Nucleic acid binder design. Structure first.
Lengths: 610, 76, 548
RNA sequence: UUGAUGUCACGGAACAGGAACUUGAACAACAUCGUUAC
């Protein structure tokens, strides 16, 4: 808490007879969902709350603005203060400015409930989520305005140089106020600035200032807002900000999904898994937009870095990162030191509506459906004709770009993401986010000089196909059957420790194969979104429920003939697990059978006593 | 890859012969008529001894899991 | 590997003894704890062999336990976990294991069915975590204080039902004795619990000798004073035992036996200044001084003589230090007790310009040396870092001090000055200026006068000069025309506070004077009555920087 | 519910670390129901 000193000294300082009070008014708008920690008790469902007003209005506290001003002033001068909460006042350059600044609060009148996000933690050995590692966090929307007033009472001719430079940084759009800045929380922008310098050194202006208690109340502020001059003062010594912004663009060809189970449980559509949407405030009402989260992109890039670098034998994914100095623990921060890269959300450059895709699970024995289960999903549609762009930006700081090894690590990771590995999104086993083209601009070719494609040149044609030998004796006038089960062997070669996705191993292979399919008999792959495709015109549409004659069509994505990846995965999986003599990978182990009994058999009906 | 299949199963690759017999495609001038039987014999104009004349005959209850494992066996 | 053990314990489970059931519960807990974090043993994807028998046994174990939830399972498992955590290597793994224990068993201690073993081991985990907190602000961190307070709260939860425990009472007293030396106040019930412990006796450790000595000095009893004198030698920490024996033999008036134990205790002091031994040494000296004894002079001088050799040489001209926050006090106590003037100015020169740094800048320097691919700065800074961070658990479990010597800095002799120069050394005492003493001293050396009186010592007050200097400094950076007469009143204060500089027998009339200042006298506005027109004045920060 | 001759608390950013991920061909042939007669 405290400890004031009570045996210090007594002094007497004369501070001249000049006094000037400068007012800077305006507003500041949110460009990203912000966060202000107010984690209170008696509510343990969500473990990261936000600060709200007793009538549920988002407020921006005074202490946060004051702390951010102190941090930016200690950034301008390249010397941090070493005060220790006691004794006589500090006489350095930063506190001597902070001793004459007055700010106010804000309310924003929006009063809509905040939105809850979820975060997990992925096991880098099996690829799935870890055990019991799941936590939520409620965030505030985007586009919320706050009024802004700042008074400086000093002895100089207007504001100092440091305050003019810091206000220029805040007008550029680099006012990183609060929150979890590592995942791209509140980044505000100061708009409509106005400034006015009073003169308390004379006698008439001092009396006119004392006559109205300053201009602190609301009527005094509405009277003062008619004597303000537009535009901020120009600084004398513009130093520089220390956060660079570099833009990213990603797009190739495939559908996209980013899971959200609670929205799937509430949504009107009713599908099993849907994508992620976010709201933005339009003054009073909110509007939804589909996006790619910031936590997911941060995790993907962190995993692409952590799987390459050796760190004396044991790779960076097998460490614990608690109290260590690693390469991943320096760029991406730890729980002892803050990070250095701030990611952001990614929007889709259009209004792509989601489609619906159905799937079923085919039994191995008696190949039919599973226990009558159809499961569907609602991804965003992307095709080789409509590539579904993704535009975004992320921030790094100055001393990371000046180094040589950090840019090397980031270039290696982004070159591995650009080539096709590390697919973004959800169900990548059936081709979601399949390929990429990652373009990064705004760093003066410091990182994007390792993301150049290099390839070899063998010119060797794939070795021919062999001629078969298994032949059958087929005659005429003898009608056959279409089923013919295949009796398997009795020994299955199991193993309890599979490889693990922790790194790229030594004697293993990684890459991709390009194929070429050709049909020899008519092919049917249906498009089950609507049933009355071949229905004639000029009649009734359909009643609420009848049993008509269903009529499907062929599968199309953007008026373009395609075959999904699930079909090919299923057929190649069936042949592959028949060859190696594997288990019945999908089966219905329950559901006892039942048979009718015959009347001729009088030996079984001789002991069914009444 | 083939050598690995020689390490587990030594010389009992007799589920690969049937798999190669079931993926066979009619090369040419061969029209193997396949279809499913009818229920009775009085409801198909060909007279092919439907499902109720096979349960007491070739496809008996004891010889049924032998004529359903050989790859191309003639039903009728 | 952790799934075959469950089946090995499930094979011979007898469901009647309290050893096989405990082993089964331990195996289940270890498998679950292996799953909670993501280790390399998560790739094992097998199961149990005999399904129906194992299902019957596991359902009978989860069903024949709910009537016996007496806390016998989790308490013993976490007890053995902490017991394995105590005997570890370097502090990193000890810290991580302690925070994992604290995180896992903090929930099960908030109900009425709270075991004594569970609360005892939770309080011990809090107390042992409270010792491993690296400071970074020239002051003690608040998390250490609140770890001590939480340990006290849980040991009070236990001792509210019983009266004597002889295990939780010792944790309570350890936490109080740790709160005392962190600048805090004793808890309100210290005397009663100290009297409950003193009425049992039987010390068997090293902490309990300190608790008993505190009790006998609190109530003036001579019961345990002879029992703590027959302890065995050749233990793991000899110096602390010799210090305790000296403090004991002091209370029964055994002189010429306190000095020998003190001298044998000084010689084997640990190399780290964070060890909980130097603080007790300064407390012993402070207690010897204000009892109007005369024994404290020898101990203070010997402690300074063996404390100076703890520096670190990293190059050919510079040195490093440690900052243990009581060095000023020990140096002032060694200055107040030394009578020879040349020895007093040899004392005053060891407090001059040094490199007393803290942890964060040493970390910066280590990363700087690893930036320039150096190798003589990753084995000399490494010793400092991994030595002063390992001596935090010094009296709980610790072993011999793992360090080495510090070398010997060569001393420049006072006979290197020319015959015309006059040397002046300044020192600002703080211990005797906190009382009504006459502040600081000046030491004048004339190297061409008689040998029997070659040194003069003068004393003066320095509070009002400090106030005048502060007023001028505060008026200098907020004005430049209203800071004109503050300079002249500061110069008059200089001429008034130390009036012996304007004499004739000391500082003869026209000889060049060499000033060596200390403290806030380095920043005096002595630019141009004053001696900057008659005597040849020149500065020097310390006397070991005198080349010609 | 304060006490007077002495309050820099506008002297202090609730901040810092965690990929809603993994598994699934929109596919398909044999019956259903019980009693009659000596």
């Amino acid at each position: 808490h405290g400890k004031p000193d009570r045996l210090e000294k007594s002094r007497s300082v004369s501070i001249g007879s000049v006094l000037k009070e400068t007012v800077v008014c305006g507003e500041l708008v949110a460009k990203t969902p912000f966060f202000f920690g107010a984690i209170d008790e008696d509510a343990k469902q969500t473990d990261l709350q936000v600060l709200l007003t007793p009538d549920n209005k988002y407020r921006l506290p005074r202490s946060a603005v004051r702390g951010i001003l102190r941090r930016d002033l200690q950034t301008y001068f390249d010397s941090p203060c070493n005060a220790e909460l006691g004794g006589r006042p500090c006489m350095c350059k930063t506190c001597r400015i902070m001793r004459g600044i007055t700010v106010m609060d804000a309310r924003s009148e929006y009063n809509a409930p905040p939105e809850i996000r979820h975060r997990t933690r992925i096991n880098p050995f099996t690829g799935t989520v870890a055990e019991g590692a799941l936590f939520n966090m409620e965030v505030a929307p985007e586009g919320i305005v706050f009024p802004f007033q700042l008074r400086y009472r000093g002895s100089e001719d207007g504001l100092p140089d440091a305050l003019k430079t810091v206000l220029k940084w805040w007008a550029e759009g680099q006012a990183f106020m609060s929150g979890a800045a590592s995942t791209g929380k509140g980044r505000f922008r100061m708009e409509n600035a106005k400034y006015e310098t009073l003169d308390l050194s004379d006698e008439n202006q001092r009396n006119d200032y004392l006559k109205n208690w300053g201009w602190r109340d609301e009527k005094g502020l509405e009277e003062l807002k008619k004597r303000l001059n537009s535009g901020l003062p120009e600084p004398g010594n513009y130093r520089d900000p220390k956060w660079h912004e570099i833009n990213v663009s990603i797009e190739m060809a495939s559908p996209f999904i980013n899971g959200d189970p609670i929205r799937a449980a509430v949504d009107k559509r009713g599908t099993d898994v849907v994508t992620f949407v976010k709201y933005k405030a339009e003054g009073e009402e909110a509007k939804p937009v589909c996006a790619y989260k910031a936590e997911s992109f941060r995790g993907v890039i962190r995993s692409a870095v952590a799987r390459i670098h050796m760190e004396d034998g044991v790779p960076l994914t097998e460490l614990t990162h608690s109290d260590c100095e690693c390469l991943l623990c320096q760029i991406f921060g730890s729980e002892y030191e803050a990070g250095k890269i701030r990611f952001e959300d990614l929007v889709f450059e259009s209004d792509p509506e989601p489609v619906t895709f159905d799937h079923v699970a085919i039994d191995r024995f008696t190949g039919g459906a599973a226990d009558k289960k159809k499961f569907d999903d609602s991804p965003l549609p992307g095709s080789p004709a409509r590539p579904l762009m993704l535009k975004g930006s992320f921030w790094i700081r100055r001393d990371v770009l000046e180094d040589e090894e950090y840019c090397k690590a980031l270039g290696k990771a982004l070159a591995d993401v650009n080539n096709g590995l590390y697919p973004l999104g959800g169900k990548s086993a059936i081709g979601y986010g399949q390929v990429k083209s990652l373009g990064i601009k705004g760093d003066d070719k410091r990182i994007s000089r390792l993301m150049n494609p290099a390839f070899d040149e063998t010119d060797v044609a794939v070795p021919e196909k062999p001629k078969t030998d298994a032949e059958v004796r087929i005659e005429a006038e003898k009608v056959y059957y279409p089923h013919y089960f295949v009796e398997p062997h009795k020994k299955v070669e199991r193993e309890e420790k599979p490889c693990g996705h922790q790194k790229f191993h030594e004697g293993r292979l990684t890459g991709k194969i390009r194929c070429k399919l050709i049909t020899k008999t008519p092919l049917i792959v249906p498009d089950t979104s609507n049933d009355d495709f071949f229905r004639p015109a000029d009649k009734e549409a359909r009643k609420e429920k009848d049993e008509y004659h269903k009529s499907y069509a062929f599968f199309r994505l953007h008026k373009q003939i395609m075959i999904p990846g699930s079909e090919l995965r299923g057929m190649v999986s069936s042949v592959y697990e028949t060859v190696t003599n594997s288990c019945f990978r999908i089966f219905d182990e329950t559901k006892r059978l039942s048979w009718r009994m015959d009347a001729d058999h009088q030996n079984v009906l001789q002991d069914f006593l009444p | 890859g083939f050598a690995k299949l020689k390490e587990w199963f030594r010389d009992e690759l007799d589920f690969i012969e049937n798999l190669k017999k079931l993926l066979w495609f009619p090369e040419g001038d061969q029209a193997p008529r396949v279809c499913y039987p009818m229920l009775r014999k009085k409801d198909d104009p060909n007279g092919n001894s439907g499902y109720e004349e096979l349960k007491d005959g070739e496809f008996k209850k004891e010889d049924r899991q032998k004529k359903l494992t050989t790859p191309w066996t003639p039903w009728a | 590997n952790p799934i075959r053990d469950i089946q090995d314990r499930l094979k011979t489970a007898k469901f009647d003894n309290k050893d096989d059931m405990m082993n089964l519960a331990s195996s289940l807990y270890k498998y679950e704890k292996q799953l909670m974090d993501s280790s390399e043993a998560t790739l094992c994807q097998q199961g149990l062999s005999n399904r129906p028998n194992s299902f019957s046994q596991l359902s009978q174990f989860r069903d024949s336990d709910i009537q016996s939830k007496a806390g016998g399972q989790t308490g013993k498992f976490w007890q053995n976990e902490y017991e394995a955590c105590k005997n570890f290597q370097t502090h990193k793994e000890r810290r991580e294991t302690l925070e994992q224990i604290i995180r896992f068993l903090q929930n099960g201690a908030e109900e009425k069915d709270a075991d004594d073993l569970l609360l005892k081991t939770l309080a011990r985990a809090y107390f042992h975590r409270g010792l491993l907190y690296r400071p970074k602000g020239f002051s003690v961190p608040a998390r250490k204080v609140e770890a001590m307070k939480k340990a006290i709260a849980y040991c009070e939860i236990i001792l509210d039902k019983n009266e004597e425990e002889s295990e939780a009472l010792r944790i309570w007293l350890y936490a109080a004795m740790e709160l005392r030396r962190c600048g805090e106040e004793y808890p309100e019930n210290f005397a009663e619990k100290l009297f409950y412990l003193a009425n049992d006796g039987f010390i068997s450790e090293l902490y309990d000798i300190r608790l008993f000595l505190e009790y006998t000095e609190r109530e003036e009893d001579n019961n345990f004073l002879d029992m703590i004198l027959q302890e065995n030698q050749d233990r793991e920490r000899l110096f602390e035992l010799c210090l305790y024996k000296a403090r004991a033999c002091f209370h029964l008036n055994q002189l010429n036996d306190v000095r020998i134990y003190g001298e044998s205790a000084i010689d084997n002091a640990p190399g780290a200044f964070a060890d909980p031994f130097w603080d007790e040494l300064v407390e012993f000296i402070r207690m010897l001084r204000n009892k109007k004894s005369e024994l404290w002079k020898e101990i203070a001088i010997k402690a300074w003589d063996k404390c100076r050799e703890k520096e670190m040489k990293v190059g050919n001209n510079i040195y490093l230090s440690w900052y243990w926050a009581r060095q000023r006090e020990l140096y002032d106590l060694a200055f107040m007790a030394q009578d020879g003037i040349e020895k007093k100015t040899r004392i005053a020169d060891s407090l001059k310009s040094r490199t007393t740094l803290r942890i964060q800048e040493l970390n910066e320097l280590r990363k700087d040396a690893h930036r320039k691919q150096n190798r003589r700065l990753e084995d000399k800074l490494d010793r400092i870092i991994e030595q002063e961070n390992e001596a935090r658990d010094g009296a709980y479990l610790r072993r011999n001090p793992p360090c080495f010597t510090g070398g010997k800095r060569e001393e420049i002799p006072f006979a290197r000055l020319p015959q015309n120069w006059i040397a002046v050394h300044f020192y600002l005492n703080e211990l005797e200026s906190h009382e009504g003493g006459k502040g600081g001293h000046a030491l004048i050396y004339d190297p061409q006068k008689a040998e029997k009186d070659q040194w003069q010592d003068k004393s003066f007050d320095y509070k009002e000069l400090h106030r005048k200097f502060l007023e001028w400094q505060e008026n200098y950076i907020l004005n430049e025309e209203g800071s004109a007469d503050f300079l002249v009143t500061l110069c008059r204060e200089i001429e008034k506070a130390m009036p012996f500089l304007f004499k004739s027998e000391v500082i003869p009339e026209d000889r060049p004077v060499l000033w060596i200042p200390h403290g806030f006298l380095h920043r005096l506005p002595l630019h141009a009555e004053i001696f900057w027109e008659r005597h040849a004045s020149r500065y020097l920060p310390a006397w070991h920087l005198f080349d010609p």
